[PDB]
Design a protein around this ligand. Structure first.
Ligand SMILES: O=C(NN1C(=O)[C@@H]2[C@@H]3C=C[C@@H]([C@H]4C[C@@H]34)[C@@H]2C1=O)c1ccc(C(F)(F)F)cc1
Lengths: 367, 367
């Protein structure tokens, strides 16, 4: 019988100089566990790789180095734009396979975030802690750890898809022939979750015929919200800038406002500070402020380094990812999002949002 | 051979105390022509009927009264909410058939605007001049007159649909049986225009299987705009208030911003003033203002009484209607919109927008 919640527990980076506390497994403890228990492989994917920037990051890197010397197959996927550290990394760990990835050779916009560890087809982390010293030690992050092999194995299948986009030797990133020669498979999805858990995926051109596009799942859940929407992301601005040209994409932004105005949903947005000289973020803040007057919309801002990407709907659905709710991300970037409708796990996430909401690092939107 | 433009010419109400001038047929001249030439019927549809409020309105009413006494079948459709004047109207013209209409007995939101005259299946006016003294004399309006029978006859078919919703005697407004027993037909549409002209229709539940929903045509044209978008409407606010409850509907609002930010379209919005205490209109103005900074978006406001509803895209498409670009209208109200891609007619409309844009009644958006 499948265990409800698929053996998932929350994982946090709660830096010493911030006021957040919890009993959850820390990112540092979690990565140490995955490395300690590994017998065949450890596969890691994130945008940047920079473990040596903090004390705990370098400790994790040493344990990983030691594993690679005992015969563990260690593969680290990073985006071709996070490749500056590469020589430093390869000199530290000559037995680890560092692979740079370009998932968007057509337009050079899409980036690999993935942000997960999987090991031995039995254990995995997924969330928003990159393989950097900051995400392991000094930056607030949120993720999920599971030792349920069916779920871990499903996450490794995302690693198979991303590894195909290696920057070398015309296979699936430099050849459209063997890029269709990779079955982009998933065992679980929103129509067939495992113990209440499933992964959603991005972008659409890597989706294949069986995976769920995270854009569609997220927007549907926002539009289904009957009571409450809690979001902790870096920004909700319907505009992003790419190539020095602004790009308007209001799909999520509209879904939130629609829930508030048309359906009466209580919404709490905890988002990052913005540049007062960025007219598109000032304008967005001013509009959010006006909605706070006449609706049950509330907005608070943080200035701490914080990678948390969390969405909770109606206390029945939790979504934790590495992507930010904006158009550059949901139209282009390579990442995998954690979805669960397990009531217990959702309650733990809600307990984390309530904490962050009243933290001293969260200040009510003032305009 | 079908005459290009389908014999259409613009029609205007240019009040004496405003600075607008043109050589176009006036609403007063136009209505006098339709009445003078009528041999079988005159069918009129608008929200309110109140001719006696101005000198020219009452003159039109006298000519209409005189026609009804010579044997012309005169039918005037008005919404059940414009029925206060009815006793005054029926005492003035006992031989005119005044019919009140409720197109939305299900929810009591949708209103009849129609706003057109058709006569003898040969002549018609369509635009935003209601059958009121104000629209005929003291309020700026814009419309189209044609004496091309194929086009007039197509407009009369809209009158057939609306007349079915009479508030009396369970047929198509109080019975779902004989409401499906009315063929909702059109001869022309966007896929089959007559001389470059076609009508679009609203709302969707009166649409039948062959008419175009105005929402879809308008949004498609905005999304197709390659160069320019010129709009003169009463408001572009993505929120409207119905039943003392606000309703968010950003579809058109988004299409405009998308054209400006993503596609570089030069946009000029000439809209009505707003209540400074209406937070949703203040917020909308503030956002439009921010877009004026970084884009080729320009906004001017008028305070005159002005019913003009005009959209021009790329100097290749003109759209003149009685509905305002908002969600209450495009989801609920009964109206017919004039569409033309005739280059000559579009140039005349563009000449009118350029005039209004630099009129002294048009003041640049100041926030
Ligand atoms: O979203 C609204 N305004 N608004 C945009 O359209 C965005 C675009 C324009 C400026 C910035 C960014 C460039 C993108 C954003 C902004 O704040 C808004 C929503 C609801 C209401 C109402 F109060 F009516 F309910 C009014 C306004």
């Amino acid at each position: 019988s499948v265990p409800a919640g698929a053996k998932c527990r929350l994982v946090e980076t709660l830096p010493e100089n911030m006021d957040f506390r919890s009993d959850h497994l820390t990112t540092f403890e979690c990565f140490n566990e995955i490395i300690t228990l590994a017998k065949k492989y450890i596969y890691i994917a994130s945008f940047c790789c920079n473990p040596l920037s903090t004390t705990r990051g370098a400790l994790i890197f040493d344990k990983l180095k030691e594993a690679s010397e005992k015969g563990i197959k260690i593969i680290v996927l990073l985006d071709e734009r996070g490749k500056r550290n590469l020589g430093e990394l390869q000199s530290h760990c000559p037995d680890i396979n560092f692979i740079t990835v370009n998932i968007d050779k057509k337009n050079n916009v899409g980036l690999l975030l993935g942000c997960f560890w999987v090991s031995d087809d039995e254990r995995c982390y997924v969330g928003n802690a990159s393989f950097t010293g900051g995400s392991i030690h000094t930056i607030k992050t949120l993720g999920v750890y599971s030792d349920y092999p069916p779920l871990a194995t499903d996450l490794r299948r995302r690693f198979d898809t991303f590894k195909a986009f290696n920057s070398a030797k015309n296979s699936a990133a430099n050849l459209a022939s063997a890029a269709a020669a990779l079955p982009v498979s998933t065992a679980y999805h929103i129509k067939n979750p495992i113990g209440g858990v499933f992964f959603t995926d991005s972008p659409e051109h890597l989706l294949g015929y069986s995976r769920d596009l995270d854009t569609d799942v997220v927007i549907d859940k926002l539009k289904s919200a009957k009571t409450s929407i809690d979001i902790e992301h870096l920004a909700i601005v319907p505009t992003t800038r790419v190539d020095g040209n602004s790009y308007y994409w209001p799909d999520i932004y509209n879904s939130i406002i629609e829930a508030a105005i048309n359906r009466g949903v209580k919404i709490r947005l905890l988002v990052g500070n913005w540049d007062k000289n960025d007219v598109y973020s000032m304008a967005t803040a001013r509009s959010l402020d006006a909605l706070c007057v006449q609706n049950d919309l509330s907005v608070k801002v943080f200035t701490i380094q914080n990678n948390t990407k969390l969405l909770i709907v109606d206390d029945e659905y939790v979504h934790i990812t590495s992507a930010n709710f904006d158009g550059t991300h949901y139209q282009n970037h390579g990442f995998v999002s954690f979805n669960s409708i397990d009531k217990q796990l959702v309650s733990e996430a809600k307990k984390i949002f309530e904490r962050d909401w009243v933290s001293s690092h969260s200040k009510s939107l003032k305009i």
